[PDB]
């Protein structure tokens, strides 16, 4: 973007703004444009636009001045060629798949996918005859194999993963896949463009659920996909039909929230790590999952491709369903609810929060234990948090 | 909704509000809830909810207090059992199709479909092996035939149509289809729940593009589908995955717009009609399309199932491309752009506006003439508009 | 504004928008600019601006692109030179007085002032040694007298009045006052720029409480003063200090509200009148206050300077406190609350609603009776409203 | 507030939210309530409210559920009894003075007042016979003298000051004034409730211009006053008339901004300091004003009552008007404009920016020099900023 702005934080702030917006104003912030359509001063011009000689969004579902800003902004951050913004994370992945994976084509994902993302791939995609292979995040062999066995159209996975924050050696995978013509999409939601640059590591496309960190205020939903033009455009097209456009007001809220992106991540990155270690050492804490810790399976990878380890920490408690429950129930600061990444701290028992619809057996089918607890550290003062968490594990 | 509320207008205003909201407040208007998630006081309750003993949206992609209002409201109007709200019309149709039509199933639609709506059905759906039969709005025979030839899963069309405002004898069609187990979905966008009750006429599902009349202010996009629970819910489920969630702020904006729905429709219904006739009589006006006119092919139907005829009026001008253009360029009140149904008056030359990507020949393939002009009458004073339009033709 | 627009409604819609905004955009609606300040490209320019060679709001408290629109719009409606926008009606009157009336100066107002507006003049202004003379709206003699007795700086009154909707022969008063150098300010809140043009009738300044009709959606507060430049500017200056700036978001909501000003008024102007007559005739209705009725004291004046009679209707019920209460309690559509002018209907018993802090005696001191009812007809269907009202006018 | 909230930051986040809102919702964020009035279910209740037996804002100008939150929030932060929120800082001071200072009363303020704030006191107040004494921030003697000479009704000043960030030994002054019955009001705008607690140091009332740090995003104006009930309430009353109500939407933006208050301040507190030092050591920098520097006149006081020194840094350059201008013009990151405290960095030449209306001589009358530059460090990366400022300074 600019030769003077070299720090991500600085960018996040003035990215796609300080230099120009395309919507001239002597205002500091971006103006929220609430329009359903864009006009023309005369048929002559309209033709020009239609003939690719002028620029216009034409219809709101195709673009918005107040949105593009955030689009370029994120683009700059991830250092991408272009970025797209849907109405929600799920939308993005959804569209992305439907757009890139041809009919009858094959795809490769990890085992630690996010609940819903899984269902889509396992129930909808097959309708299009799109088959998939589910390998473990680490198991690079399986990938290399599958790469040769079938004709992979695209490899897709989130790194860190959910909720065990498992990580994929992006650079490596990227290499393998590209050797077989496969495409690589990394859901760096948990990571954040600040703690890693999937695109830089070789990944083809990187998408985020701005609902979490980017907006980081727990008050807006939004999808987001960034990558090479020739690629992202193909999706935007399909997007222009599925109509999952993002409202301006939402867009703005994200821009504003990203004004203090670095600040928020920084703090969370710490609190988490420190709180992580503290928990691991705790007797009542059976296990702790966090890329920052040395105990983490791919810690060496995290250390190699990341600069931070997110603000989400998962850990099993030394008890059972009701016991673990007792724990979270004791907490006083975090809110018991889904989502994560906002200033407000949140906690939840995945087993119940997003898997209660299954049997104890079918649950364990995917590491989901009744002890497993997911802590999304907010931005509250560390000491305040720790004391709460501690005062909690005590009640058990 | 209420016994003491019988006129549509009165409903549109107080529908799903005057009696209660679910979010207790001594405030007149509906409060805009900007949350990305909902919390619980204790694990105990969370369980209850999960076990269907308590009520909660849980996540923002699944529901919102500031949205449900609008949901119930529209439900009340269309006199439906339950309504759903997407991020945009296109979203609705899209989902609904992908949700109801099984893989390899067959569907029946009309020829006067809206551009994009067409494409989806002709390019995406086929990927799921879903075939379709395109018949003329009037051609009831073709329908009855197709009904017996293949196994129709659902009949879908808009009434009035776009842009020739063709109308489908809903009551009749409904009967035929239901005889063969097919489902009927009517896109009464142009109609508006005020000018017609497709659901009452027997239709299974009626959907609208709130972007137009419902919001009627040209500052927000929104999809909307109403109908029976057992049905709409099946969609809501898939919607919870494709994530085309509507933002609370947008929702409210519609709630506000519908506060004066009738008032707005009423005036538009007039101006349109009156202006229509004046146009038909004009020498320079080759042809005029409008259900209100006696010249309209299905006027007898329009007169039978409708109470008004929208504010949109299409008409071919006695000239050619450049000539017709010269006309619109002369106008001083309406804006030249897509969309319609807002207080502001809008005009466009479909040929260019949304078909310029095709050849003169391929264009005519669907009645789209270079003369054809689509006038979306705003809410400005009649005389002002008339004088404008006339003074415009004055130069051709 | 333009030549093609001749009806107020048409204006209210495209006033200060259709032709240009000063904030170039190809969007239909006005963009909400959320900025606290405005920048410059270089010191050179800043100087220019400071030297009145360039244009800029500099600080938000001095202006806003999204506000000025609404400013020019109202200007056009009232046919004024320039208009100002405060945070609330009260602010307007407040500022206006503090701005024009010199220290120790004298002022003349009517007896039927709005509660608070009264207190200010009776408790604050005296601090600046500003004395006042309270005359009866009709009593033109008293005015002519005072005009000669003391040295009147400005005559200020609302027409119609609150809550007895009394009316002042603007043209006449204007003439008298100006003969003595006094200024005239009319609070045409109840009237609305559509039902009368105080400025055209000679008034110096006309102010409204956009909180009511202009916004007409019961979801925003706003002051508003229109008049000649040389005058209004003197107020804007003081305004730039008292800092009662109006928020952009608020401004927009008004502009949006005014997009259907005529439509709403028109309907209310009817419902009220019709309902009024019906009420007068009713046996349980002791008295009815409404300029539209022939029974109204200044009906001949109303008929001469207005074109409509608002939507507010006051009337005493044939009972007492508890009885009148029983009436309003029976109503099902209107909301028991202050304010008025919104699509939603509202009712209140001034005696309690805004005078319960006084004694039964001190209350009657100003016509406020325990029977007095103030009905602010919404936009709901007439029949629906009437049925309701009657259904109550019988449970007594 | 609560127990589990000991750190300011933690408070700023969950202050007046985590435990309850008064507007029940299972939502994380506070819901924006856009209403102009509040209703009642029956006359009976209304009476209750009017008789102080129930609670209700009645009218929007008197309160809003979405506002009170921010109110209590700030209250908690400053550790006050109650807080009030105006439409803009200026409004606050304005109302505050007009509300507390009786007619003919006397007041004492410092010489480094903010431009506008000065004028009001020097032009309006005198209309109410309110005389004032202007002493230097440090000159306690003058204060102690005035205290005995006349009958001071209230001592008012800002600390730090603008733009020389001078500081007042709050504790001391408070002690003296309270001995003579005077009231103390501190404008801790520059400080921020995080860098100092005027109320704790003894001050009677502390006010802020949320337009700056509190909102910290340069997209909203808002005044704010906190202090003891018996006091603040007296202001809220007059405020209920001058009608300088703050809009809900605006209120929310602040609430959202304060979600990361500490984070923001922290960073700015550093950058400023560090940058300060660097500047002072610079050869081209003639002088530097910052409470954090040892060179600062009241550094020992700042060090004793503050924990931080804001992000605002003033410094004179070794050149002249045109030279200093050349400097700021060279800057690439900060915007040249008024205001300060938002994530975006801002610079300005007080001489021109807010004193160009005066003569070179009348300007110097108050330390305002053509070299004087006020830098409000944003949140961008330090190195990024430094490099800029540096590269800037060289141009000379
Ligand atoms: C890695 C990842 N990717 C994509 C999404 C979907 O993005 P969207 O929500 O903006 O559409 C989510 C959602 N994550 C959660 C939301 C879950 C909803 P559920 O808890 O299953 O009802 C969560 O709790 O962590 C996620 O964790
Ligand atoms: C009956 C009907 N239904 C549903 C939709 C789509 O709803 P959505 O836009 O909210 O997704 C439309 C769009 N109609 C138009 C919009 C077109 C977009 P274009 O102007 O072709 O780029 C139009 O003819 O003006 C329509 O005419
Ligand atoms: C003619 C008129 N002018 C100016 C104002 C004050 O402007 P603002 O409200 O926008 O600040 C009012 C308020 N009127 C009412 C509001 C009253 C509030 P209360 O009932 O005293 O609590 C009413 O008659 O219902 C009014 O009726
Ligand atoms: C200490 C202090 N107090 C109160 C106010 C007024 O609050 P409000 O702005 O929210 O009404 C200001 C304004 N400060 C500035 C605003 C100046 C306006 P200008 O552009 O100089 O006319 C500034 O430091 O640049 C201030 O610095």
PDB file of C-alpha atoms in Angstrom, chain B residues 18 21 23-39 55-58 249 252, chain D residues 18 21 23-39 55-58 249 252:
ATOM      1  CA  UNK B  18     -48.067  -3.501  19.528  1.00  0.00           C
ATOM      2  CA  UNK B  21     -41.825  -8.206  21.150  1.00  0.00           C
ATOM      3  CA  UNK B  23     -37.514  -8.172  24.115  1.00  0.00           C
ATOM      4  CA  UNK B  24     -39.429  -6.217  26.773  1.00  0.00           C
ATOM      5  CA  UNK B  25     -39.225  -2.424  26.461  1.00  0.00           C
ATOM      6  CA  UNK B  26     -41.388   0.570  27.252  1.00  0.00           C
ATOM      7  CA  UNK B  27     -40.132   1.956  23.943  1.00  0.00           C
ATOM      8  CA  UNK B  28     -42.365   2.518  20.944  1.00  0.00           C
ATOM      9  CA  UNK B  29     -39.996   1.302  18.246  1.00  0.00           C
ATOM     10  CA  UNK B  30     -38.163  -2.013  17.950  1.00  0.00           C
ATOM     11  CA  UNK B  31     -34.684  -2.006  19.498  1.00  0.00           C
ATOM     12  CA  UNK B  32     -31.772  -2.776  17.194  1.00  0.00           C
ATOM     13  CA  UNK B  33     -29.795  -5.628  18.774  1.00  0.00           C
ATOM     14  CA  UNK B  34     -26.202  -5.666  17.515  1.00  0.00           C
ATOM     15  CA  UNK B  35     -24.962  -8.991  18.865  1.00  0.00           C
ATOM     16  CA  UNK B  36     -23.066 -11.840  17.229  1.00  0.00           C
ATOM     17  CA  UNK B  37     -23.999 -14.318  19.929  1.00  0.00           C
ATOM     18  CA  UNK B  38     -26.295 -14.973  22.867  1.00  0.00           C
ATOM     19  CA  UNK B  39     -25.250 -16.100  26.338  1.00  0.00           C
ATOM     20  CA  UNK B  55     -35.868 -20.501  23.823  1.00  0.00           C
ATOM     21  CA  UNK B  56     -32.670 -18.916  22.474  1.00  0.00           C
ATOM     22  CA  UNK B  57     -31.105 -17.848  19.185  1.00  0.00           C
ATOM     23  CA  UNK B  58     -27.740 -19.067  20.472  1.00  0.00           C
ATOM     24  CA  UNK B 249     -29.623  -2.753  11.173  1.00  0.00           C
ATOM     25  CA  UNK B 252     -34.883  -2.393  11.357  1.00  0.00           C
TER      26      UNK B 252
ATOM     27  CA  UNK D  18     -21.895  -7.775  32.378  1.00  0.00           C
ATOM     28  CA  UNK D  21     -28.645  -3.613  31.747  1.00  0.00           C
ATOM     29  CA  UNK D  23     -33.173  -3.876  29.194  1.00  0.00           C
ATOM     30  CA  UNK D  24     -33.116  -7.692  29.401  1.00  0.00           C
ATOM     31  CA  UNK D  25     -31.481  -9.558  26.502  1.00  0.00           C
ATOM     32  CA  UNK D  26     -29.415 -12.687  26.066  1.00  0.00           C
ATOM     33  CA  UNK D  27     -27.306 -10.482  23.820  1.00  0.00           C
ATOM     34  CA  UNK D  28     -23.644  -9.727  24.446  1.00  0.00           C
ATOM     35  CA  UNK D  29     -23.651  -6.130  23.273  1.00  0.00           C
ATOM     36  CA  UNK D  30     -26.010  -3.368  24.358  1.00  0.00           C
ATOM     37  CA  UNK D  31     -29.048  -2.916  22.073  1.00  0.00           C
ATOM     38  CA  UNK D  32     -29.422   0.418  20.293  1.00  0.00           C
ATOM     39  CA  UNK D  33     -32.852   1.793  21.168  1.00  0.00           C
ATOM     40  CA  UNK D  34     -34.118   4.221  18.520  1.00  0.00           C
ATOM     41  CA  UNK D  35     -37.254   5.676  20.103  1.00  0.00           C
ATOM     42  CA  UNK D  36     -38.502   9.200  20.612  1.00  0.00           C
ATOM     43  CA  UNK D  37     -40.773   8.258  23.474  1.00  0.00           C
ATOM     44  CA  UNK D  38     -41.726   5.586  26.020  1.00  0.00           C
ATOM     45  CA  UNK D  39     -45.241   4.270  26.611  1.00  0.00           C
ATOM     46  CA  UNK D  55     -39.258   4.102  36.589  1.00  0.00           C
ATOM     47  CA  UNK D  56     -39.409   5.428  33.021  1.00  0.00           C
ATOM     48  CA  UNK D  57     -37.605   7.883  30.756  1.00  0.00           C
ATOM     49  CA  UNK D  58     -41.014   9.061  29.557  1.00  0.00           C
ATOM     50  CA  UNK D 249     -26.510   5.433  17.885  1.00  0.00           C
ATOM     51  CA  UNK D 252     -23.370   3.015  21.240  1.00  0.00           C
TER      52      UNK D 252
END
